Amino acid sequence: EKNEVMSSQLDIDNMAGVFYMLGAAMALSLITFISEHLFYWQ
Amino acid sequence: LLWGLVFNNSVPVQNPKGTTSKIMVSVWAFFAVIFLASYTANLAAFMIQEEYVDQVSGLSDKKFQRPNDFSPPFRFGTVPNGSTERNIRNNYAEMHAYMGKFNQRGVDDALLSLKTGKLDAFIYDAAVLNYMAGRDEGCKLVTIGSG
Amino acid sequence: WVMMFVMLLIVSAVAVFVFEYVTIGKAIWLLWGLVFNNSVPVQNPKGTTSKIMVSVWAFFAVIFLASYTANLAAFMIQ
Amino acid sequence: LTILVKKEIPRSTLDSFMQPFQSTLWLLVGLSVHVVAVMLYLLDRFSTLSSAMWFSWGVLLNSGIGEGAPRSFSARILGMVWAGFAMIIVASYTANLAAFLVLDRPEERITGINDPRLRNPSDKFIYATVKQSSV
Amino acid sequence: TLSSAMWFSWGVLLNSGIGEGAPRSFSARILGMVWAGF
Amino acid sequence: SQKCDLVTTGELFFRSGFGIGMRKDSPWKQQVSLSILKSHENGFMEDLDKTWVRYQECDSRSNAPATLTCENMAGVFMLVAGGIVAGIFLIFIEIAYKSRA
Amino acid sequence: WVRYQECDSRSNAPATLTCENMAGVFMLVAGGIVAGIFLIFIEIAYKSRA
Amino acid sequence: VGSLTINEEREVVDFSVPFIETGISVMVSRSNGTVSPSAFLEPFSACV
């Protein structure tokens, strides 16, 4: 009854949690910096 | 500075006075190491005792409707001059197209072809598949998903 | 263990010699406890091949910690 | 009275330093360390360019080289992403280590008299014995 | 630093960067090597 | 599959089917079993199989081996408040010591 | 006569880690330290320029 | 006595009671590994 495959290689399709949204939150941090630049106007 | 200490950062933090500050840091450090140990003990325990699922039941519809969607290397089986060919051709063989190139008379030739990967899938009667799956080359698993 | 211990003595002798440019005994134990993730504020060197060889040793530090832990839990089973 | 069979070959040769897959994945992520460290330096510029990368190397190797305390809060949030990802990496690597160390072993050991590869033998199966015996 | 020297052993025991007790005797650094080992 | 909290150990001793009982020498054997084949040759048997018994509610045997969501950690969730309310008196002790020393 | 066990049992110690396999990562200590001397010569060339 | 089933046009032939049961399957091979994108306790521990 379907016990176990054997693996040592890292699943590169399991890397979706690694490029889980780093750059999107980095873009929100850029908009945070732009809103800081508008807070310099105030 | 008092967040990265759960992850053993490099990060030289501002050292506070010798007060309840550093006491509550050590209090949080207990929960830091106990969470690191517990998460690692779970994570390695998920690499073991895990069932590994194949996708043969959905592709019984999906690769039937769309055999060319993912890869034109989808080399199908047959039961040539078989009653099952007509029965699917009357019911569920829009893949009686695309499969005239995939005709193999002689079952063991189709066996060794798919064992070298020259076929993707091979449709047949169940019982001969299950018996030769139990007699398959050692321990190569060749069954259908869940039986 | 005693092989990497004398490798630590070797790189400390290198850090003494090639940085004739603080390393009598401090170069040993400050650059020794980093395999065990010590608290221990070490003397931060120049930005040179010093910190490069620290990062080189830090690779072997984390890979030895992972390998020993993966063996040790595997001795509790089987 | 039992069956004499032959020893198998183990799962030795533990030269598996990159068999947890690094030769693409570690090579991919090491460049993105630098390419996001330079833009984070520009983020702390417009509010040590060659020096700011060593802070990310310090947090990646648990090594106390620390000089890059970011005056922008958002780059400290990016450092929180680094300490999260690096602890995820070393935890997943240790789970792949211990799992590959002890997972299973494929076994084709015969049972005894009631095994079908014995009772219905192949052409490859010399299951003979000695002559003039009680067997 | 009699009451203060214990916090260095607590710092090495919890991986927490409270560090003030760098021993001028080499042998107490050897005892710290026993601590980080244990 | 339906209610919960039971298992079976496999080992199908009989391997039988569910026919339909009629009196002997009926005129209703052949065409009825022909319609049994016809109900097999469209998957309509499997259609009613979907509509009646293919409803898994409880989990399998599988052993996810574990899960760690919220529940067990309450024994170590008291560490954050077990001493912080007395550390105020420890501040009062320290300011009493600094008033002495 | 027969109570003389020489070879190990089936048992599966599951593993041992003494000396042998680590030679693939024992090259990390010397793979760059011999070129770091030229990196010192590069740095003193840069400081002679800058 | 050959290992044959019936369809509806097999009116011509007259079976006995079926002694064994079988069906129509497909045969594939193994993969190696599974997907588990490092996120098992991440919504679980996210509650804490």
UniProtKB/Swiss-Prot annotation, chain B:
Q: How is it modified after translation?
A: Phosphorylated on tyrosine residues.
Q: Which residue intervals make up region (Pore-forming)?
A: 1-16
Q: Which residues are recorded as binding L-glutamate?
A: 83-84, 125
Q: Which residues form a coiled coil?
A: none
> Which parts of this protein are intramembrane?
1-16
Q: Which residues lie on this side of the membrane: Extracellular?
A: 40-147
Where does the entry say this protein is expressed, by tissue?
A: Expressed in the hippocampus including the dentate gyrus (at protein level). Detected in adult olfactory bulb, brain cortex, hippocampus, striatum, thalamus, superior colliculus, with much lower levels in inferior colliculus, midbrain and cerebellum.
* Residues the UniProt record annotates as site (Functional determinant of NMDA receptors): 8
**Where does it live in the cell?**
Cell membrane; Postsynaptic cell membrane; Late endosome; Lysosome
> Which ranges does the record mark as transmembrane?
24-39
Positions bearing carbohydrate? 81
Taken from the record's topology, the Cytoplasmic segments are: 17-23
Q: Tell me the subunit arrangement.
A: Heterotetramer. Forms heterotetrameric channels composed of two GluN1/zeta subunits (GRIN1), and two identical GluN2/epsilon subunits (GRIN2A, GRIN2B, GRIN2C or GRIN2D) or GluN3 subunits (GRIN3A or GRIN3B) (in vitro). Can also form heterotetrameric channels that contain at least two GluN1 subunits and at least two different GluN2 subunits (or a combination of one GluN2 and one GluN3 subunits) (in vitro). In vivo, the subunit composition may depend on the expression levels of the different subunits. Found in a complex with GRIN1, GRIN3A and PPP2CB. Found in a complex with GRIN1 and GRIN3B.
Q: Which family does it belong to?
A: Belongs to the glutamate-gated ion channel (TC 1.A.10.1) family. NR2B/GRIN2B subfamily.
Q: What is known of its domains?
A: The extracellular N-terminal domain (ATD/NTD) endows NMDARs with a unique capacity for allosteric modulation, harboring several binding sites for small molecule ligands that act as subunit-specific allosteric modulators of ion channel activity. A hydrophobic region that gives rise to the prediction of a transmembrane span does not cross the membrane, but is part of a discontinuously helical region that dips into the membrane and is probably part of the pore and of the selectivity filter.
Function per UniProt: Component of N-methyl-D-aspartate (NMDA) receptors (NMDARs) that function as heterotetrameric, ligand-gated cation channels with high calcium permeability and voltage-dependent block by Mg(2+). Participates in synaptic plasticity for learning and memory formation by contributing to the long-term depression (LTD) of hippocampus membrane currents. Channel activation requires binding of the neurotransmitter L-glutamate to the GluN2 subunit, glycine or D-serine binding to the GluN1 subunit, plus membrane depolarization to eliminate channel inhibition by Mg(2+).
State the protein's name.
Answer: Glutamate receptor ionotropic, NMDA 2B
Q: What is the originating organism of this protein? A: Rattus norvegicus
Shown part of the complete sequence: 608 to 754 of 1482
Curated annotation (Swiss-Prot), chain F:
Q: What tissues contain this protein?
A: Detected throughout the brain, in brain cortex, cerebellum, thalamus and olfactory bulb.
Location in the cell reads:
Cell membrane; Postsynaptic cell membrane; Synaptic cell membrane; Postsynaptic density membrane
Cystine residue pairs: 4-58
Q: How is it modified after translation?
A: NMDA is probably regulated by C-terminal phosphorylation of an isoform of NR1 by PKC. Its phosphorylated state is influenced by the formation of the NMDAR-PPP2CB complex and the NMDAR channel activity.
Entry-listed glycosylation sites: 31
Locate the transmembrane regions by residue number: 73-93
Entry function: Component of N-methyl-D-aspartate (NMDA) receptors (NMDARs) that function as heterotetrameric, ligand-gated cation channels with high calcium permeability and voltage-dependent block by Mg(2+). NMDARs participate in synaptic plasticity for learning and memory formation by contributing to the long-term potentiation (LTP). Channel activation requires binding of the neurotransmitter L-glutamate to the GluN2 subunit, glycine or D-serine binding to the GluN1 subunit, plus membrane depolarization to eliminate channel inhibition by Mg(2+).
* Domain notes from UniProt: A hydrophobic region that gives rise to the prediction of a transmembrane span does not cross the membrane, but is part of a discontinuously helical region that dips into the membrane and is probably part of the pore and of the selectivity filter.
Query: Could you describe the subunit structure of this protein?
Result: Heterotetramer; the NMDAR subunits are modular and harbor tiered domains that function in concert to regulate opening and closing of the cation-selective ion channel pore. Forms heterotetrameric channels composed of two GluN1/zeta subunits (GRIN1), and two identical GluN2/epsilon subunits (GRIN2A, GRIN2B, GRIN2C or GRIN2D) or GluN3 subunits (GRIN3A or GRIN3B) (in vitro). Can also form heterotetrameric channels that contain at least two GluN1 subunits and at least two different GluN2 subunits (or a combination of one GluN2 and one GluN3 subunits) (in vitro).
Which family would the database say this protein is a member of?
Belongs to the glutamate-gated ion channel (TC 1.A.10.1) family. NR1/GRIN1 subfamily.
Tell me what this protein is called: Glutamate receptor ionotropic, NMDA 1
Q: Which organism is it from?
A: Rattus norvegicus (Rat)
